[PDB]
Design a protein around this ligand. Structure first.
Ligand SMILES: *[C@@H]1O[C@H](CO[C@@H]2O[C@@H](C)[C@@H](O)[C@@H](O)[C@@H]2O)[C@@H](O[C@@H]2O[C@H](CO)[C@@H](O[C@H]3O[C@H](CO[C@H]4O[C@H](CO)[C@@H](O)[C@H](O)[C@@H]4O[C@@H]4O[C@H](CO)[C@@H](O)[C@H](O)[C@H]4NC(C)=O)[C@@H](O)[C@H](O[C@H]4O[C@H](CO)[C@@H](O)[C@H](O)[C@@H]4O[C@@H]4O[C@H](CO)[C@@H](O)[C@H](O)[C@H]4NC(C)=O)[C@@H]3O)[C@H](O)[C@H]2NC(C)=O)[C@H](O)[C@H]1NC(C)=O
Lengths: 52, 154, 207
């Protein structure tokens, strides 16, 4: 419930992710919210990677 | 043609649906949409119209003093200064959901924002027996899209 | 083709005797080329002729809007007489009738409470005074604000919302400077309703 929400809220505002990455991060998040913790970190670091 | 319910969009654990009664690419699953396709403004015709997007203040008002001599009282949740008008207020006592509430329409305030009032009726026995009442707001302006301000009797 | 809309009197005009209720008929999309429109009025199918009808140019879509206001007596509105407006034009084969009438039925006085600003809001530049009016039938009500005898005009209020018991509740929010909430000695919420003694009840608060 609560963890997988802050997940969704941050993933949606990560500014260097592209459409498809964000799209698949959510999908791969509402399908087994267990790894909500790890899926943030994953998207988090893939953002910094793709900064200009 | 209608938008989806705003609580359905601002929480990933629910499903927003566009009702006839996607950017010119056919989809064959009607009877439901991705939360992100609506927020970034795709055309379904209808879209999520953005404008100024201000975040609400959320205060709980207790029963007015004059009403506490009665057999029923009224909790008030005033939510102020938000945009767009679309918002979702709902009530809990600790963790169990209270649903004898009614709420007004979003009203345009003087600064072009919106306020909304929500009113939980309960027996006066319930107001002094139950330890917490929490009012639960879901606007896009809020962090995590969620906000929970709580009042207790004293 | 043109269309007619009918509109019931101002709840403030009804709940004060010195003032004068009016029923109104508005005609929209009257062609600029035939702005002549005939309007007859029928308080209980009795034709009446006191209707004041004006013809207006709607500069937005280049059409004519006709407005006929028939002033009425309190007792005929309050009793539930059925006011009717017939409207005939060239662009109307056979005319168009609108009818309106008060909803005689259940009536309940409101309770009226002033809610002080929430505790968390005392610290900004502006506060919010709440007037909670609950339990009234029918849904037509009037809430205004005063601080002593000086009328306050920065109020906004909600639609009467139907509560659970079949009553209407309503909220009126007076925003003000936080200096005003602490400077001024008394703020009054003032409700008019057809269920109150003298159609009026005043509730007043201090800091
Ligand atoms: C050409 O342009 C004009 C003007 O354009 C308008 O104004 C410009 C400036 C632009 O802003 C533009 O976008 C606007 O469109 C168009 O004129 C409009 O035409 C509409 C119909 O096509 C007509 O429809 C609604 O009328 C009622 C609302 O009107 C009141 O509120 C308006 C909002 O502020 C205001 O403009 C009006 O003046 C009017 O105000 C009130 O007037 C009283 C009399 O003077 C006064 O006492 C009162 O104080 C005052 N208050 C306020 C706050 O203004 C609606 O109620 C009405 O609803 C009915 O019809 C629709 C569909 O038919 C339903 O969805 C409704 O539910 C309702 O049906 C009734 O339902 C009830 C139950 O719900 C039943 O019991 C009844 O039997 C039903 N029928 C009746 C007759 O009651 C309309 O939705 C606009 O009012 C009208 N405005 C004006 C100013 O003329 C015009 O159409 C254009 N032509 C085109 C596009 O071809």
């Amino acid at each position: 419930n609560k963890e997988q929400q802050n997940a969704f809220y941050e993933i949606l505002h990560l500014p260097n992710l592209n459409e498809e990455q964000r799209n698949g991060f959510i999908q791969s998040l509402k399908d087994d919210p267990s790894q909500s913790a790890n899926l943030l970190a994953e998207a988090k670091k893939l953002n910094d990677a793709q900064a200009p | 043609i209608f938008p989806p319910n705003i609580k359905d969009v601002l929480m990933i654990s629910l499903t927003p649906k566009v009702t006839c009664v996607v950017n010119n690419v056919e989809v064959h699953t009607a009877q439901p949409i991705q939360h992100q396709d609506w927020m970034s403004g795709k055309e379904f015709t209808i879209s999520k119209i953005k404008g100024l997007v201000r975040a609400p203040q959320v205060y709980i008002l207790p029963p007015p003093a004059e009403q506490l001599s009665r057999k029923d009282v009224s909790l008030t949740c005033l939510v102020v200064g938000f945009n767009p008008g679309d918002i979702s207020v709902e009530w809990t006592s600790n963790g169990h959901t209270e649903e004898n509430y009614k709420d007004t329409a979003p009203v345009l305030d003087s600064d072009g924002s919106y306020f909304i009032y929500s009113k939980l009726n309960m027996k006066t026995s319930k107001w002094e027996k139950t330890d917490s009442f929490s009012c639960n707001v879901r606007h896009e302006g809020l962090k995590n899209y969620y906000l929970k301000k709580t009042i207790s009797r004293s």
